[PDB]
Amino acid sequence: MNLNATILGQAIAFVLFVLFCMKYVWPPLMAAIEKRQKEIADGLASAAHK
Amino acid sequence: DLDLAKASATDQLKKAKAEAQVIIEQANKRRSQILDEAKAEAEQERTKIVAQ
């Protein structure tokens, strides 16, 4: 259709959202969730017969 | 599991630690019994031989 500056505007939005996700969101979300999973994994590892 | 581990470990170890020493002192009671019986019959043997 009409070749328009909106494409480059949307590219700026796309790249900055990916960078914000990489910096702020993803590392802490995965850290908290997998730290719960780690605690349950050790809950398996902990289990008086031994 | 950790609580029952503590409880069972202490229970087992302290119970056996008591009974072992108790049996060893019982063996000393039998030791004193045997030693005094040997002494008494040794001197009865001597007295009977000299009376003979």
mmCIF file of all heavy atoms in Angstrom, chain B residues 13-33:
data_model
loop_
_atom_site.group_PDB
_atom_site.id
_atom_site.type_symbol
_atom_site.label_atom_id
_atom_site.label_comp_id
_atom_site.label_asym_id
_atom_site.label_seq_id
_atom_site.Cartn_x
_atom_site.Cartn_y
_atom_site.Cartn_z
ATOM 1 N N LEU B 13 20.256 -44.510 69.243
ATOM 2 C CA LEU B 13 21.613 -44.425 69.765
ATOM 3 C C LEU B 13 21.612 -44.433 71.286
ATOM 4 O O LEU B 13 22.384 -45.172 71.903
ATOM 5 C CB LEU B 13 22.310 -43.176 69.217
ATOM 6 C CG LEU B 13 23.834 -43.022 69.366
ATOM 7 C CD1 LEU B 13 24.284 -42.688 70.790
ATOM 8 C CD2 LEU B 13 24.541 -44.277 68.866
ATOM 9 N N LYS B 14 20.751 -43.626 71.914
ATOM 10 C CA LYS B 14 20.767 -43.563 73.372
ATOM 11 C C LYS B 14 20.262 -44.857 74.012
ATOM 12 O O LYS B 14 20.828 -45.298 75.026
ATOM 13 C CB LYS B 14 19.995 -42.322 73.837
ATOM 14 C CG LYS B 14 18.521 -42.476 74.162
ATOM 15 C CD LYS B 14 17.950 -41.095 74.490
ATOM 16 C CE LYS B 14 16.584 -41.160 75.154
ATOM 17 N NZ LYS B 14 15.623 -41.981 74.369
ATOM 18 N N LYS B 15 19.259 -45.520 73.421
ATOM 19 C CA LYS B 15 18.803 -46.793 73.977
ATOM 20 C C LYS B 15 19.898 -47.855 73.921
ATOM 21 O O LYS B 15 20.171 -48.539 74.923
ATOM 22 C CB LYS B 15 17.550 -47.269 73.239
ATOM 23 C CG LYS B 15 16.969 -48.557 73.797
ATOM 24 C CD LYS B 15 16.617 -48.418 75.268
ATOM 25 C CE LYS B 15 15.783 -49.597 75.747
ATOM 26 N NZ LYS B 15 15.595 -49.599 77.226
ATOM 27 N N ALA B 16 20.534 -48.015 72.756
ATOM 28 C CA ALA B 16 21.608 -48.999 72.647
ATOM 29 C C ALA B 16 22.792 -48.630 73.538
ATOM 30 O O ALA B 16 23.429 -49.508 74.136
ATOM 31 C CB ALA B 16 22.045 -49.137 71.192
ATOM 32 N N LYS B 17 23.112 -47.333 73.622
ATOM 33 C CA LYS B 17 24.199 -46.859 74.470
ATOM 34 C C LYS B 17 23.948 -47.181 75.936
ATOM 35 O O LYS B 17 24.900 -47.388 76.698
ATOM 36 C CB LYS B 17 24.376 -45.352 74.263
ATOM 37 C CG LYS B 17 25.563 -44.714 74.967
ATOM 38 C CD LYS B 17 26.878 -45.189 74.375
ATOM 39 C CE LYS B 17 28.045 -44.377 74.906
ATOM 40 N NZ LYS B 17 28.019 -42.997 74.352
ATOM 41 N N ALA B 18 22.680 -47.221 76.349
ATOM 42 C CA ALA B 18 22.363 -47.637 77.712
ATOM 43 C C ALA B 18 22.489 -49.154 77.887
ATOM 44 O O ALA B 18 23.186 -49.625 78.800
ATOM 45 C CB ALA B 18 20.956 -47.162 78.088
ATOM 46 N N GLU B 19 21.830 -49.930 77.017
ATOM 47 C CA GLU B 19 21.802 -51.383 77.204
ATOM 48 C C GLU B 19 23.187 -52.013 77.092
ATOM 49 O O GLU B 19 23.484 -52.990 77.793
ATOM 50 C CB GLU B 19 20.832 -52.037 76.220
ATOM 51 C CG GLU B 19 19.385 -51.587 76.354
ATOM 52 C CD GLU B 19 18.877 -51.572 77.797
ATOM 53 O OE1 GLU B 19 19.268 -52.458 78.591
ATOM 54 O OE2 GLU B 19 18.068 -50.684 78.135
ATOM 55 N N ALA B 20 24.045 -51.490 76.214
ATOM 56 C CA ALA B 20 25.379 -52.064 76.067
ATOM 57 C C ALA B 20 26.170 -51.965 77.368
ATOM 58 O O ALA B 20 26.714 -52.962 77.863
ATOM 59 C CB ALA B 20 26.117 -51.362 74.928
ATOM 60 N N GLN B 21 26.230 -50.760 77.941
ATOM 61 C CA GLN B 21 26.945 -50.559 79.195
ATOM 62 C C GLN B 21 26.319 -51.379 80.316
ATOM 63 O O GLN B 21 27.029 -51.925 81.177
ATOM 64 C CB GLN B 21 26.942 -49.075 79.554
ATOM 65 C CG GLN B 21 27.789 -48.729 80.758
ATOM 66 C CD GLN B 21 29.176 -49.321 80.659
ATOM 67 O OE1 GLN B 21 30.018 -48.825 79.919
ATOM 68 N NE2 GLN B 21 29.424 -50.381 81.404
ATOM 69 N N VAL B 22 24.986 -51.479 80.323
ATOM 70 C CA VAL B 22 24.315 -52.254 81.362
ATOM 71 C C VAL B 22 24.712 -53.725 81.278
ATOM 72 O O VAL B 22 25.001 -54.362 82.299
ATOM 73 C CB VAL B 22 22.789 -52.059 81.266
ATOM 74 C CG1 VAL B 22 22.051 -53.258 81.849
ATOM 75 C CG2 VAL B 22 22.375 -50.776 81.970
ATOM 76 N N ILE B 23 24.751 -54.286 80.066
ATOM 77 C CA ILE B 23 25.158 -55.680 79.912
ATOM 78 C C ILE B 23 26.618 -55.862 80.306
ATOM 79 O O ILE B 23 26.998 -56.894 80.866
ATOM 80 C CB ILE B 23 24.888 -56.167 78.475
ATOM 81 C CG1 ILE B 23 23.386 -56.313 78.255
ATOM 82 C CG2 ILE B 23 25.587 -57.494 78.189
ATOM 83 C CD1 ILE B 23 22.677 -57.017 79.399
ATOM 84 N N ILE B 24 27.460 -54.870 80.021
ATOM 85 C CA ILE B 24 28.867 -54.987 80.400
ATOM 86 C C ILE B 24 29.015 -55.034 81.921
ATOM 87 O O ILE B 24 29.783 -55.843 82.465
ATOM 88 C CB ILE B 24 29.680 -53.844 79.760
ATOM 89 C CG1 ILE B 24 29.775 -54.086 78.252
ATOM 90 C CG2 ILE B 24 31.065 -53.761 80.363
ATOM 91 C CD1 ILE B 24 30.281 -52.900 77.453
ATOM 92 N N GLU B 25 28.256 -54.202 82.638
ATOM 93 C CA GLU B 25 28.284 -54.289 84.099
ATOM 94 C C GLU B 25 27.667 -55.590 84.610
ATOM 95 O O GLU B 25 28.092 -56.116 85.647
ATOM 96 C CB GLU B 25 27.600 -53.075 84.723
ATOM 97 C CG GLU B 25 28.460 -51.821 84.666
ATOM 98 C CD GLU B 25 29.928 -52.136 84.927
ATOM 99 O OE1 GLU B 25 30.262 -52.510 86.072
ATOM 100 O OE2 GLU B 25 30.749 -52.014 83.992
ATOM 101 N N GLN B 26 26.653 -56.118 83.921
ATOM 102 C CA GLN B 26 26.145 -57.442 84.274
ATOM 103 C C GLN B 26 27.243 -58.489 84.130
ATOM 104 O O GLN B 26 27.369 -59.406 84.957
ATOM 105 C CB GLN B 26 24.926 -57.777 83.406
ATOM 106 C CG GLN B 26 24.061 -58.954 83.878
ATOM 107 C CD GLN B 26 24.579 -60.325 83.456
ATOM 108 O OE1 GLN B 26 25.692 -60.469 82.954
ATOM 109 N NE2 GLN B 26 23.757 -61.347 83.668
ATOM 110 N N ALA B 27 28.048 -58.369 83.073
ATOM 111 C CA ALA B 27 29.187 -59.260 82.907
ATOM 112 C C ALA B 27 30.190 -59.084 84.036
ATOM 113 O O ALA B 27 30.833 -60.054 84.445
ATOM 114 C CB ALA B 27 29.854 -59.016 81.553
ATOM 115 N N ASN B 28 30.339 -57.868 84.555
ATOM 116 C CA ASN B 28 31.184 -57.698 85.739
ATOM 117 C C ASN B 28 30.568 -58.338 86.979
ATOM 118 O O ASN B 28 31.302 -58.821 87.852
ATOM 119 C CB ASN B 28 31.465 -56.222 86.009
ATOM 120 C CG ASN B 28 32.523 -55.660 85.101
ATOM 121 O OD1 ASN B 28 33.634 -55.374 85.541
ATOM 122 N ND2 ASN B 28 32.203 -55.511 83.833
ATOM 123 N N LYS B 29 29.240 -58.337 87.097
ATOM 124 C CA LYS B 29 28.619 -59.063 88.203
ATOM 125 C C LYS B 29 28.922 -60.556 88.109
ATOM 126 O O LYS B 29 29.272 -61.197 89.111
ATOM 127 C CB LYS B 29 27.111 -58.804 88.219
ATOM 128 C CG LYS B 29 26.760 -57.356 88.474
ATOM 129 C CD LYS B 29 25.273 -57.096 88.282
ATOM 130 C CE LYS B 29 24.981 -55.601 88.293
ATOM 131 N NZ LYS B 29 25.334 -54.958 89.591
ATOM 132 N N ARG B 30 28.830 -61.118 86.901
ATOM 133 C CA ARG B 30 29.201 -62.522 86.722
ATOM 134 C C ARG B 30 30.697 -62.738 86.946
ATOM 135 O O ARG B 30 31.104 -63.788 87.455
ATOM 136 C CB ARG B 30 28.764 -63.011 85.338
ATOM 137 C CG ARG B 30 27.262 -63.291 85.267
ATOM 138 C CD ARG B 30 26.807 -63.946 83.970
ATOM 139 N NE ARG B 30 26.679 -62.980 82.883
ATOM 140 C CZ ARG B 30 26.472 -63.305 81.615
ATOM 141 N NH1 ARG B 30 26.386 -64.569 81.228
ATOM 142 N NH2 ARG B 30 26.337 -62.338 80.714
ATOM 143 N N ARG B 31 31.529 -61.760 86.578
ATOM 144 C CA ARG B 31 32.962 -61.842 86.851
ATOM 145 C C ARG B 31 33.244 -61.921 88.351
ATOM 146 O O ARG B 31 34.031 -62.763 88.802
ATOM 147 C CB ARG B 31 33.681 -60.640 86.240
ATOM 148 C CG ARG B 31 35.109 -60.484 86.725
ATOM 149 C CD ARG B 31 35.838 -59.375 86.005
ATOM 150 N NE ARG B 31 36.253 -59.770 84.663
ATOM 151 C CZ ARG B 31 37.087 -59.071 83.908
ATOM 152 N NH1 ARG B 31 37.566 -57.901 84.305
ATOM 153 N NH2 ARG B 31 37.425 -59.540 82.713
ATOM 154 N N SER B 32 32.643 -61.020 89.135
ATOM 155 C CA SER B 32 32.835 -61.063 90.582
ATOM 156 C C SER B 32 32.278 -62.349 91.180
ATOM 157 O O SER B 32 32.907 -62.935 92.073
ATOM 158 C CB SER B 32 32.196 -59.841 91.250
ATOM 159 O OG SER B 32 30.819 -59.734 90.936
ATOM 160 N N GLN B 33 31.114 -62.804 90.699
ATOM 161 C CA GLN B 33 30.567 -64.087 91.133
ATOM 162 C C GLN B 33 31.577 -65.209 90.928
ATOM 163 O O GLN B 33 31.895 -65.953 91.864
ATOM 164 C CB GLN B 33 29.277 -64.385 90.363
ATOM 165 C CG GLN B 33 28.633 -65.742 90.647
ATOM 166 C CD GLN B 33 28.217 -65.913 92.089
ATOM 167 O OE1 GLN B 33 28.532 -66.917 92.725
ATOM 168 N NE2 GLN B 33 27.502 -64.927 92.617
#
